[PDB]
Coordinates of C-alpha atoms in Angstrom, one line a residue:
Chain A
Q1 CA 1.9 19.4 -57.9
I2 CA -0.9 21.6 -57.0
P3 CA -2.2 21.4 -53.3
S4 CA -5.5 20.0 -52.9
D5 CA -8.4 22.2 -52.2
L6 CA -6.8 24.3 -55.3
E7 CA -7.9 21.9 -57.9
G8 CA -10.7 22.1 -59.8
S9 CA -12.1 25.3 -61.3
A10 CA -14.2 27.8 -59.3
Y11 CA -15.9 31.0 -59.9
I12 CA -18.5 33.5 -58.0
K13 CA -21.9 33.5 -59.5
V14 CA -23.8 36.8 -58.7
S15 CA -27.6 36.8 -59.7
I16 CA -30.5 38.8 -59.5
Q17 CA -34.2 37.1 -58.9
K18 CA -37.6 37.8 -58.0
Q19 CA -37.7 34.8 -55.8
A20 CA -37.4 33.9 -51.9
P21 CA 1.3 25.6 -71.7
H22 CA 0.5 22.4 -70.0
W23 CA 1.4 23.5 -66.4
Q24 CA 0.6 27.2 -67.5
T25 CA -3.4 26.1 -67.6
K26 CA -3.3 23.9 -64.2
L27 CA -1.2 27.2 -62.5
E28 CA -3.4 29.7 -63.8
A29 CA -6.7 27.7 -62.6
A30 CA -5.4 27.0 -59.1
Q31 CA -4.3 30.8 -59.0
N32 CA -8.1 31.6 -60.0
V33 CA -9.5 29.4 -57.5
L34 CA -7.4 30.8 -54.8
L35 CA -8.6 34.5 -55.3
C36 CA -12.2 33.3 -55.5
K37 CA -11.7 31.7 -51.9
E38 CA -10.3 35.3 -50.8
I39 CA -13.2 37.3 -52.6
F40 CA -15.9 35.1 -50.9
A41 CA -13.9 34.9 -47.6
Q42 CA -14.2 38.5 -47.8
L43 CA -17.7 38.8 -48.4
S44 CA -19.1 36.3 -46.0
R45 CA -17.0 37.7 -43.1
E46 CA -18.3 41.3 -44.0
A47 CA -21.7 40.0 -44.2
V48 CA -21.6 37.8 -40.9
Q49 CA -19.7 40.7 -38.9
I50 CA -20.3 44.2 -40.2
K51 CA -24.0 45.9 -39.2
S52 CA -25.4 46.7 -42.3
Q53 CA -29.1 47.8 -43.4
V54 CA -31.2 44.9 -44.4
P55 CA -28.8 42.0 -43.2
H56 CA -28.0 38.8 -45.4
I57 CA -27.7 35.1 -44.6
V58 CA -24.8 33.3 -45.4
Chain B
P1 CA -16.9 -17.0 -41.1
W2 CA -17.4 -14.2 -43.0
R3 CA -15.0 -12.2 -45.4
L4 CA -15.0 -8.4 -45.5
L5 CA -14.0 -7.8 -49.5
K6 CA -14.7 -4.2 -49.5
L7 CA -14.9 -1.5 -46.7
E8 CA -15.7 2.2 -47.7
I9 CA -16.7 5.1 -45.4
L10 CA -19.3 7.4 -47.0
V11 CA -19.0 10.3 -44.8
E12 CA -17.6 13.3 -47.2
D13 CA -16.9 16.9 -46.6
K14 CA -14.8 18.4 -49.3
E15 CA -13.6 21.4 -47.2
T16 CA -12.3 20.1 -43.8
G17 CA -10.8 17.3 -45.6
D18 CA -8.9 19.6 -48.0
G19 CA -10.4 18.6 -51.2
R20 CA -9.3 14.7 -50.6
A21 CA -10.9 11.6 -48.8
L22 CA -11.8 12.0 -45.3
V23 CA -9.8 8.8 -44.3
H24 CA -7.1 7.3 -46.0
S25 CA -7.0 3.8 -47.3
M26 CA -4.4 3.0 -44.6
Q27 CA -6.8 3.8 -41.9
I28 CA -9.6 1.8 -43.9
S29 CA -7.4 -1.0 -44.4
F30 CA -6.6 -1.0 -40.6
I31 CA -10.4 -0.8 -39.9
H32 CA -10.5 -3.6 -42.5
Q33 CA -8.3 -5.9 -40.2
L34 CA -10.0 -5.1 -37.0
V35 CA -13.5 -6.0 -38.2
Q36 CA -12.2 -9.1 -39.8
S37 CA -10.8 -9.9 -36.4
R38 CA -13.7 -9.5 -34.4
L39 CA -15.5 -11.4 -37.3
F40 CA -12.7 -14.2 -36.5
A41 CA -14.1 -14.0 -32.9
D42 CA -17.5 -15.9 -34.2
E43 CA -19.9 -14.5 -31.9
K44 CA -23.5 -13.3 -33.6
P45 CA -21.0 -11.4 -35.9
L46 CA -22.9 -8.7 -37.6
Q47 CA -24.2 -6.9 -34.7
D48 CA -20.5 -6.6 -33.8

């Protein structure tokens, strides 16, 4: 029984543009979702709170 | 009078509600009974 909020699949997607074994799969996917949420929480907090050159929008 | 065959709540956010529905079917069935009762009050029903 995986927690809800950890089901499905998630991944970070980074882009540059010129513009304005059954349970093993489930537990690996949920752990990957947890780590992607950890990454994006770190990134969004550093974007909002840390003062940097040419600021970002979250 | 009217029967309330299916009531559904369309308001959804998949983050505050932790990847699940915003309102459990228990509470939806409760509101089903409440609006069915106020339909049985037999006023102008659809405004209520």
